[PDB]
Amino acid sequence: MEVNQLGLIATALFVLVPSVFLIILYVQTESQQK
Amino acid sequence: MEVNQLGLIATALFVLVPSVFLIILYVQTESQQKS
Amino acid sequence: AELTPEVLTVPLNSEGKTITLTEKQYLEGKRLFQYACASCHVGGITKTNPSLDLRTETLALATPPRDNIEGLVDYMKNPTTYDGEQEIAEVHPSLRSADIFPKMRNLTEKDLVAIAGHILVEPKILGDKWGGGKVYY
Amino acid sequence: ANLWERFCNWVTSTDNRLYVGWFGVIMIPTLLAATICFVIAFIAAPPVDIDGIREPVSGSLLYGNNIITGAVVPSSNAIGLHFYPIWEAASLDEWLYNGGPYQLIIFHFLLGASCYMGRQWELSYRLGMRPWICVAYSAPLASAFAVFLIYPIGQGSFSDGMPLGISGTFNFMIVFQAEHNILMHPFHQLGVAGVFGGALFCAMHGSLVTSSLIRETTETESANYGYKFGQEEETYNIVAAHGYFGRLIFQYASFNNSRSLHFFLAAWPVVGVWFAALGISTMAFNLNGFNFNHSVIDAKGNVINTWADIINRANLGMEVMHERNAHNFPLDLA
Amino acid sequence: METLKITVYIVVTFFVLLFVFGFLSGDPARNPKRKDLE
Amino acid sequence: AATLTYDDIVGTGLANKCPTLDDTARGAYPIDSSQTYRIARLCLQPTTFLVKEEPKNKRQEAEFVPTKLVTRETTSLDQIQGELKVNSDGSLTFVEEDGIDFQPVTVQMAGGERIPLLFTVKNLVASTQPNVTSITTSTDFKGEFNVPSYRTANFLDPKGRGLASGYDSAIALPQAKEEELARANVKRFSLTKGQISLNVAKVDGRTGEIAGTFESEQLSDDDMGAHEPHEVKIQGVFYASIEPA
Amino acid sequence: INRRVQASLASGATLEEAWSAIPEKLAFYDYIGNNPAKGGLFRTGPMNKGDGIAQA
Amino acid sequence: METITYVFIFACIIALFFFAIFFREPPRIT
Amino acid sequence: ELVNVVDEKLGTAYGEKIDLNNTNIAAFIQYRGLYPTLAKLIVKNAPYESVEDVLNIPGLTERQKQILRENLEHFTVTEVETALVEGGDRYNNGLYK
Amino acid sequence: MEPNPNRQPVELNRTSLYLGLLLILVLALLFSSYFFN
Numbered sequence A: 001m002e003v004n005q006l007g008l009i010a011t012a013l014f015v016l017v018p019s020v021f022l023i024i025l026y027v028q029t030e031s032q033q034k
Numbered sequence B: 001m002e003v004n005q006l007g008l009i010a011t012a013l014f015v016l017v018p019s020v021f022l023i024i025l026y027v028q029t030e031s032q033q034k035s
Numbered sequence C: 001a002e003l004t005p006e007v008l009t010v011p012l013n014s015e016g017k018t019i020t021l022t023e024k025q026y027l028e029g030k031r032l033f034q035y036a037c038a039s040c041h042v043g044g045i046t047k048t049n050p051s052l053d054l055r056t057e058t059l060a061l062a063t064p065p066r067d068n069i070e071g072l073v074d075y076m077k078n079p080t081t082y083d084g085e086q087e088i089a090e091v092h093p094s095l096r097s098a099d100i101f102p103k104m105r106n107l108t109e110k111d112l113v114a115i116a117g118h119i120l121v122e123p124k125i126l127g128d129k130w131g132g133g134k135v136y137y
Numbered sequence D: 001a002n003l004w005e006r007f008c009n010w011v012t013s014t015d016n017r018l019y020v021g022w023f024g025v026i027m028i029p030t031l032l033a034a035t036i037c038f039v040i041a042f043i044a045a046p047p048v049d050i051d052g053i054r055e056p057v058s059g060s061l062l063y064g065n066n067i068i069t070g071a072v073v074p075s076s077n078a079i080g081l082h083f084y085p086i087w088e089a090a091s092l093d094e095w096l097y098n099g100g101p102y103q104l105i106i107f108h109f110l111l112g113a114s115c116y117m118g119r120q121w122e123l124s125y126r127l128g129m130r131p132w133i134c135v136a137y138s139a140p141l142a143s144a145f146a147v148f149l150i151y152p153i154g155q156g157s158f159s160d161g162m163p164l165g166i167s168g169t170f171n172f173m174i175v176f177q178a179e180h181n182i183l184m185h186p187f188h189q190l191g192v193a194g195v196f197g198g199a200l201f202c203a204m205h206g207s208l209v210t211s212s213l214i215r216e217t218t219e220t221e222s223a224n225y226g227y228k229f230g231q232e233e234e235t236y237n238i239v240a241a242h243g244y245f246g247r248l249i250f251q252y253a254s255f256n257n258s259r260s261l262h263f264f265l266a267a268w269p270v271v272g273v274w275f276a277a278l279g280i281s282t283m284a285f286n287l288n289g290f291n292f293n294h295s296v297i298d299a300k301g302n303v304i305n306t307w308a309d310i311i312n313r314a315n316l317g318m319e320v321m322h323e324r325n326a327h328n329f330p331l332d333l334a
Numbered sequence E: 001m002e003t004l005k006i007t008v009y010i011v012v013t014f015f016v017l018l019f020v021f022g023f024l025s026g027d028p029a030r031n032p033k034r035k036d037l038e
Numbered sequence F: 001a002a003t004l005t006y007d008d009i010v011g012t013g014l015a016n017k018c019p020t021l022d023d024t025a026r027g028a029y030p031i032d033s034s035q036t037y038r039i040a041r042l043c044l045q046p047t048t049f050l051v052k053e054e055p056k057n058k059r060q061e062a063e064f065v066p067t068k069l070v071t072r073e074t075t076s077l078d079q080i081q082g083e084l085k086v087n088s089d090g091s092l093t094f095v096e097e098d099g100i101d102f103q104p105v106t107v108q109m110a111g112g113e114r115i116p117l118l119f120t121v122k123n124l125v126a127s128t129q130p131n132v133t134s135i136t137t138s139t140d141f142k143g144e145f146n147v148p149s150y151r152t153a154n155f156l157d158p159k160g161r162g163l164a165s166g167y168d169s170a171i172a173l174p175q176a177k178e179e180e181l182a183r184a185n186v187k188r189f190s191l192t193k194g195q196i197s198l199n200v201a202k203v204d205g206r207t208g209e210i211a212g213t214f215e216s217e218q219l220s221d222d223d224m225g226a227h228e229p230h231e232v233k234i235q236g237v238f239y240a241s242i243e244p245a
Numbered sequence G: 001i002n003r004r005v006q007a008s009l010a011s012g013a014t015l016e017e018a019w020s021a022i023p024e025k026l027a028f029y030d031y032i033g034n035n036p037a038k039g040g041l042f043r044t045g046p047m048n049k050g051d052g053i054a055q056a
Numbered sequence H: 001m002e003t004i005t006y007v008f009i010f011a012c013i014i015a016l017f018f019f020a021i022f023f024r025e026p027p028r029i030t
Numbered sequence I: 001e002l003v004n005v006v007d008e009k010l011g012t013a014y015g016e017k018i019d020l021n022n023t024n025i026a027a028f029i030q031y032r033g034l035y036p037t038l039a040k041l042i043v044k045n046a047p048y049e050s051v052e053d054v055l056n057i058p059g060l061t062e063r064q065k066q067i068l069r070e071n072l073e074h075f076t077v078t079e080v081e082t083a084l085v086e087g088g089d090r091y092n093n094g095l096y097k
Numbered sequence J: 001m002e003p004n005p006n007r008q009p010v011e012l013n014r015t016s017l018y019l020g021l022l023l024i025l026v027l028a029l030l031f032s033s034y035f036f037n
C-alpha cells in the first residue's frame, strides 16, 4: 500500500519521546530517599 | 537521491534508545540522596 | 395557492366533457384511495409493478384510455393489462373480484368516482412527485 | 477438606488477586476464546463475504486495513441466523470466507460479558456489599446484546450485526439511520440525553468535589496527597459544594444528600442507556423513528418541507447506496 | 471437524457442570455475615 | 422405498446431489428415429474443481491443480431441460433450453488465491457419436456452451464503478492521470466458450434415465475486464431423464 | 551441465534438445548472482532486491 | 511496516495492562 | 483500446428508439398498445435483421399487426449487445422507480 | 515478601553521561551514511 513514508518515524517518535519523558521522571522519583 | 527508506528511523532509534538509557541513569543518580 | 374549482375540474370522458369535483369529493377520494389502494399505489407508483404508474400521461396511453373518470371507474370494476388485452380482476382489486378483495365490498359507485377524481387531481397538485417515487420525495 | 470442597473454596475465595467465582468459571474461558480469535482475525483473517453475494470485504490488517478501517467482518447473509461453528465448515478456508470468526467471537463474548455481570453480583455478595453495581453494568451489556444479537434476530441475519471494527461501526450506524430513522426515535433521544447528561453530570460532580477539597497540602505538592486511602473523614466539604451549586442555580435544585446525589449519578446514564438499548432492540422489529415525511401541506396540497423532509433526503442517499449489489427487488424489507 | 466438535462439547459440558455444581455447593453460606440461610 | 420429502432432505446436503442409478442399471434405451425426444432433467454435480497454474516465462507444461471449495454445497446445475434431436447420421444432439444452468463458485488455491467462476452449461449443444440406435454405457456426449461474465452489467465495484451503471472514473483521485486507471475504470463484459464431455456409465432402459461422469473446461471470472481469467477444469457426476416429447 | 549436455549429444540429441533438457534449477545455480560472496555489508534484504526476481 | 507498527502498539498496551494490574503500587490504609 | 459498450450504444439508434434486439421490456410502455402482450412476443422472438421482421412473429392477430405497423417508426434494430441481454436483463434490468 | 537483600543502587555520573552521549552521537554520525546507503 502506498502509505506516507514518514508515518513510521512520526509514530515511533510520538510514542518514544513522551514515553521516555515519563520513564525518566518515574525512575528518578523512585531513586529519591524513602 | 534514492536512499534506503529505513535509514531515517534506523539512525533516529540508534541515537535515541541508548541516549535515553543514559539520560535515565544520570537523572536518577542526581536525584539520589547526598552525603 | 388554493384547491380551486379549476384544479378540481377533470375529464369525465374521452370526448371533452369535464366534471368539477367538490372539496368533499376530493377529501373522500383521498380517504378512499388510502383505504383501498395506497398499500400498493402510495404516491402514484405501483409497488408490485413499478413499471406502471398512475401518472395522467401514462393513463392516457393505456388501452382503453384511463385518463378520465369513466376509464378509471371502469378500471375499478374490470381492470385490464395496459394494452387492454387481459382482464386482471383475479389479481387486482375490483368490484368484480370483491369476493377475494373484501375491501372492495363496501365501495359504492359514488366512492369509485371519488377515487377516480383523486387519481386525476393529485398530479395537478403534486406534479412529478405523483408517480415519481423516492427520487422526488 | 476433600478436593471439591477445596476447589470451591478457591474459586469463591475473597483472597484471589482477581476474583474467579462460579460466573468466572464460564467467563474466563469464553472471554479468552473471544479475545484470542478476535486478535488473530483482526490481524490475519482473509476477506469475508458479509452480504452473501460473493463480494468479500477485507477486514484485517495484513489484507490492507489500518486500525480505523479494520474489522472482524459479520458472517454471511447466506448463513442468516444459522449457527456456524468451525465444525459445520468443510475447512477453515471455507469457515473464513463465510465469516465464521464473527460468530465465534460474538457468542463467546456475549456469554462472557453476561458472566462478567453475574460476577459483579457474586463478588459484592462475598464482600458484604450492596448488590446493584451489576445492574448499572446491565446498561452497556444490554446495548451490546442489542447490536450483536437482537438486531440480527429481528432482521434475520448475523450479517446485519454490528461489525467488530471502527469503520464497521459507522457503517452499521449509517445504514441503521437509513432503515429506521433512529435519530427521530425517542428511545435513541433518551439515550443521547443519557450520555450527554452522564458526561455533563460527570464533569459537574468532578468539578464540585474538586472545588471543595479541604486544604491539607502546600502549593508545591499535588492536592491529591491531602487524601489518604481509607481515611475515615470526608475529604471535601459537601456543605460548601452545595452552598456553591445551590446559588449557581437555586437552593432546591442542588443536592445536599450525598446518597441521593450518587444515586442520581447512577440512574441518569443507566436509565438513558437502557432506553438506547431498547431503541436498537425495538427497531430490530422495525418499529421505527417518527416519520413526518410530507406532514406539512399548504392550502392547495403542495408539500411544504420541514427539517424532517431534509433528514429524509439524507436517509434516501444512504438507502439507495448501501450494499449496492445486494438488492434485486424494489423494497428493502430486511 | 468431528473431533473438534466432540472436544468442544466435552469442554463446554465440563465448565457448565462446574458452574452448576459450584452454585449448588452451599453458595448462600459463602458470605461474610449470616450463613444459616437453609 | 423412501420417496423423500423436503423435510427429509432439508439441511442434509442431499439437495446439491444428483440422483444416482444402482449398479444393475447397465441397459439400453432405444431411440426411435421417427420419435422426438427431450431431456426432462439434466443434473450436474461437480466433485472437483481444478485450476490451471499460471507458469513463469519457462513455457513449461502448466498443470491443473486441486483447490478447496469455499462457497459450500451451492455448486450443482439442475432442472435443466431441452430438445434431444435425432440427426440424419443417427447421432443425438442435446440443445439446452432452460434450467438452473449456472452457479457462481469460489475455490481457493494453495496459498490463499481465490478463484471465482460461473460454473455453467448455458446454451449447451452436445452431441453423441453417429448411429446411436440405443443410448448405452458406450454413449457419450461432447459439446460446447457459453460462459458469460461472472458479474452482469449492473455490478458495481467497491468504488462505485460499473458498466451499465456506476461512475466512469476514480472519483477519489480527482486529478489523477486517467490512462493508468483505464483498465479498472472501463468495465468490459466477457463472453467465452466452454467445452464439456458427458460419459454415460449407467442406463435404465425402462425409465429413460442415464447417469455418468462429466468433465468440463471453461474460463473463470475476469472481474469485468480488470484481470486475466484462469482456466478451470470441472469434474463430477451427472444424471439425465430422457423422454419422448 | 556440460556433462549432461555431452551425454545428450552422444545419445543423438540436437544441440537445441541437449540444452533444452537442462533443468532451469540446475542452470540457475551456475549464475554468480546466487554466489554468497558477491554481496555487501550494507546491501540490505533479499537477493531479489538486487538482480530481481528470476523469471526464466 | 504499518501492520508491524499497529501490532507493536497494541502489544505494548497489553503488556502495560499486565504491569498496571500485577505490578501496581499497592493501595495502603492509614 | 477499452470502450464502455453501453455508453457506445447510446450513440447509435439504441439511444433514440426502442431497439427490438436490446432494449429492456419496460420501454414498450411508452406507446399505446405494446405492453405487455406484444412486448413479450417481441423480446421472445428477437433478434431481428430489420424492424419490419417483427411483423413475421407467428400467431399475431390482425389487430396486433396493425399496432406493430403503427409503431415501427419508434423501433430500431442494432447488433445484439451481450451486456444488455445477459442476466435476463431485458425482462428486469434492476431499475424500478 | 520480605525485601531482596541483593538489590543495589545504580549510578551514572555526569562525565559518563557526556562520554556516553559523545560515543552514541559519533557512532551515529559515522554509521548514518551506511544506514541511508
Ligand code: CLA
Binding pocket: D025, D026, D027, D029, D030, D033, D083, D084, D085, D086, D087, D103, D104, D105, D107, D108, D111, E008, E009, E011, E012, E013, E015, E016, E017, E019, E020
Ligand atoms: C466455559 C467455557 C466455554 C463455553 C461456555 C463455550 C461456549 C461456546 N463455544 Mg467454546 N471454547 C472453549 C470454552 C467454552 N466455549 C474453550 C476452552 C475452547 C478451546 C478448546 C473453545 C473452542 C470453541 C470453538 C473452536 C468453537 C466453540 C463454540 C462455542 C459455542 C458452542 C458450544 C456448543 O455447541 O456446545 C453445546 C454443548 C452443550 C449444550 C452440552 C451442555 C450439557 C449441559 C450439562 C446441559 C445444560 C444446557 C443448558 C441450555 C445450559 C444452561 C444452564 C444454565 C441454567 C446455568 C458456544 C458459544 C463454537 C462457536 O463459537 O460457534 C459459532 C465453535 O466453533 N468454542
Ligand code: CLA
Binding pocket: D113, D139, D140, D141, D142, D143, D144, D146, D147, D172, D173, D174, D176, D177, D182, D183, D188, D191, D192, D195, D196, D273, D276, D277, D278, D279, D280
Ligand atoms: C451527537 C450525536 C450523537 C450522540 C451523542 C449519539 C449517542 C448514542 N448513539 Mg447514536 N447516532 C448518531 C448520533 C449520535 N448518537 C447518528 C448521526 C446516527 C446515524 C449515523 C446514529 C446511529 C446510532 C446507532 C445505529 C446506534 C447509536 C447508539 C448510540 C449510543 C452509543 C453508546 C452506547 O451504545 O453505549 C452503550 C455501551 C456499549 C455498547 C458498550 C458495551 C461494552 C461491553 C459490555 C463491554 C466491552 C468490553 C471491551 C471489548 C473491552 C474493554 C477493554 C478493557 C477490558 C481492556 C449513544 C446513546 C447505539 C445504541 O443506542 O446502542 C444501544 C447504536 O446502536 N446511534
Ligand code: CLA
Binding pocket: G041, G042, G043, G044, G045, G046, J027
Ligand atoms: C544472526 C542474526 C541474523 C542473521 C544472520 C539475519 C539474516 C537476515 N535477515 Mg534478519 N533479523 C535478525 C537477525 C538476523 N537476521 C534479528 C535479531 C531481527 C529483528 C531486528 C531480524 C529481522 C529481520 C527483518 C525485518 C528482515 C530481515 C532480513 C534478513 C536478511 C537480510 C539481512 C540484512 O540485510 O542484513 C543487513 C545487515 C547489516 C546492515 C549489518 C548491521 C551492522 C550493525 C549496525 C553494526 C553495529 C556496530 C556497533 C554499533 C558498533 C559499536 C562500537 C562500540 C563497541 C565501540 C537475512 C537473511 C530481511 C529479509 O529479507 O527478510 C525476508 C528483512 O526484511 N531480518
Ligand SMILES: CC(C)=CCC/C(C)=C/CC/C(C)=C/CC/C(C)=C/CC/C(C)=C/CC/C(C)=C/CC/C(C)=C/CC/C(C)=C/CC/C(C)=C/CC1=CC(=O)C(C)=C(C)C1=O
Binding pocket: D201, D204, D205, D206, D208, D209, D238, D241, D242, D245, D246, D249, D253, D254, D255, D256, D261
Ligand atoms: C440589561 C438588564 C435588563 C439587566 C437586568 C439584570 C437583572 C438584575 C435581572 C434580575 C431579574 C431576573 C433574575 C430575571 C430573570 C430572567 C430569566 C428567567 C433569565 C434566565 C433564563 C434561563 C434560560 C435560565 C437557564 C437556567 C437553567 C435552565 C439551568 C438548569 C436547571 C437544571 C435542569 C439544572 C440541573 C439540575 C440538576 C438535576 C442538578 C444535579 C446534577 C449535578 C449538579 C450533579 C452534581 C452535584 C450536585 C450537588 O448539589 C453537590 C453538592 C455536588 C458535590 C455535586 O456533585
Ligand SMILES: CCCCCCCCCCCCCCCC(=O)OC[C@H](CO[C@@H]1O[C@H](CS(=O)(=O)O)[C@@H](O)[C@H](O)[C@H]1O)OC(=O)CCCCCCCCCCCCCCC
Binding pocket: D010, D016, D017, D018, D019, D020, D027, D028, D031, D032, D035, H017
Ligand atoms: C498451553 C496453554 C495455552 C493457553 C494460554 C492461556 C493462559 C494459561 C496460562 C497458565 C498460567 C496462569 C498464570 C496466571 C497469572 C495470574 O493470574 O496470577 C495472579 C493470581 C495469583 O494466583 C495465585 O497463585 C497462588 C500461588 S502462587 O502465588 O502462584 O505461588 C495460589 O496460592 C492462589 O490460590 C492463586 O490464585 O491468580 C488469580 O488471581 C486467580 C486467577 C485469575 C485468572 C484471571 C484470568 C482473567 C482472563 C479474563 C479475560 C481477559 C482477556 C484478556 C484481555 C486483557
Ligand SMILES: CCCCCCCCCCCCCCCC(=O)OC[C@H](COP(=O)(O)OC[C@@H](O)CO)OC(=O)CCCCCCCCCCCCCCC
Binding pocket: B017, B018, B021, B022, J011, J012, J013, J015, J016, J017, J019, J020, J022, J023, J026, J027
Ligand atoms: C535491541 C535492544 C537494544 C537496547 C540498547 C541499549 C544500549 C545502551 C548502550 C550504552 C552504551 C553507553 C556507553 C557509556 C559510556 C560511559 O559511561 O563512559 C564512562 C565509564 C566510566 O565508568 P566508571 O567505572 O568511572 O563508573 C562511573 C559510573 O557512573 C558509570 O555508570 O566507563 C565505561 O563505561 C567504559 C566504556 C568507555 C567508553 C567510553 C568511550 C568514549 C570515547 C568517545 C568516543 C567517540 C569519539 C571518537 C572520536 C574519534
Ligand code: HEC
Binding pocket: C033, C036, C037, C038, C039, C040, C041, C046, C048, C049, C052, C053, C054, C055, C058, C059, C062, C066, C072, C075, C076, C080, C081, C082, C088, C092, C093, C115
Ligand atoms: C396491489 C396489491 C394493488 C392494489 C391494492 C391496487 N392496485 Fe392498482 N395496480 C396494481 C398493479 C400491479 C397494477 C399493474 C397491473 C398490470 O398488469 O397492468 C395496477 C394497475 C393500476 C392501474 C392502471 C395504471 C396504468 O394504466 O398506468 C390503475 C388505474 C390502478 N391500478 C388503480 C387502482 C385503484 C384505484 C386501486 C384501489 C381501489 C388499486 N389500483 C389497488 C396493484 C395494485
Ligand SMILES: CCCCCCCCCCCCO[C@@H]1O[C@H](CO)[C@@H](O[C@H]2O[C@H](CO)[C@@H](O)[C@H](O)[C@H]2O)[C@H](O)[C@H]1O
Binding pocket: D004, D005, D008, E021, E024, E025, E026, E027, E029
Ligand atoms: C432435570 C434434571 C434433574 C436432576 C435431578 C436431581 C437434582 C439435582 C441434585 C443436585 C445435588 C447436589 O447436592 C449438593 O452437592 C454439593 C456438592 O457436594 C454439596 O456439597 C457442598 O456442601 C456444603 C453446603 O453448605 C458446601 O459448603 C461444600 O463446599 C460442598 O461440598 C451440597 O451441600 C449438596 O446439597
Ligand SMILES: CCCCCCCCCCCCO[C@@H]1O[C@H](CO)[C@@H](O[C@H]2O[C@H](CO)[C@@H](O)[C@H](O)[C@H]2O)[C@H](O)[C@H]1O
Binding pocket: A020, A027, A030, A031, A032, A033, A034, B016, B017, B020, B021, B024, B028, B032, B033, J008, J009, J010, J011
Ligand atoms: C527507549 C529505551 C528505554 C530504556 C529503559 C531503561 C530503563 C532503566 C531503568 C533503570 C532503573 C534504576 O532503578 C532504580 O534504581 C534506584 C537506585 O539506583 C532504586 O533506588 C534505591 O536507591 C536510592 C539510592 O540509594 C535511594 O535514594 C532510594 O530510596 C532506593 O529505592 C530505585 O528504587 C529503582 O527504581
Ligand SMILES: CCCCCCCS[C@@H]1O[C@H](CO)[C@@H](O)[C@H](O)[C@H]1O
Binding pocket: C089, C090, C096, C097, C098, C099, C100
Ligand atoms: C369455465 C370456468 C368458469 C369459472 C368462472 C369465471 C370467474 S373465476 C373467478 O375470478 C373472479 C374475478 O373475475 C373472482 O372474483 C373469483 O374469485 C375467481 O374464482
Ligand SMILES: CCCCCCCS[C@@H]1O[C@H](CO)[C@@H](O)[C@H](O)[C@H]1O
Binding pocket: D040, D044, F110, F111, F112, F113
Ligand atoms: C499463529 C499464526 C496464525 C496466522 C495464520 C495465518 C493463516 S496461514 C497463511 O495463509 C495465507 C493465505 O492462505 C498464505 O498466503 C500464507 O502463506 C500462510 O502463511
Ligand code: OEX
Binding pocket: D051, D077, D155, D159, D160, D175, D179, D322, D323, D326, D332, D333, D334
Ligand atoms: O444486509 Mn446489511 O442492510 Ca438490513 O436492510 Mn436489507 O439487509 Mn442489507 O439491505 Mn438494508
Ligand SMILES: [Ca+2]
Binding pocket: F137, F138, F139, F199, F200, F201
Ligand atoms: Ca461409459
Ligand SMILES: [Cl-]
Binding pocket: none
Ligand atoms: Cl416513466
Ligand SMILES: [Cl-]
Binding pocket: D171, D175, D321, D322, D323, D324
Ligand atoms: Cl453498506
Ligand SMILES: [Cl-]
Binding pocket: D326, D327, D328, D329
Ligand atoms: Cl432483494
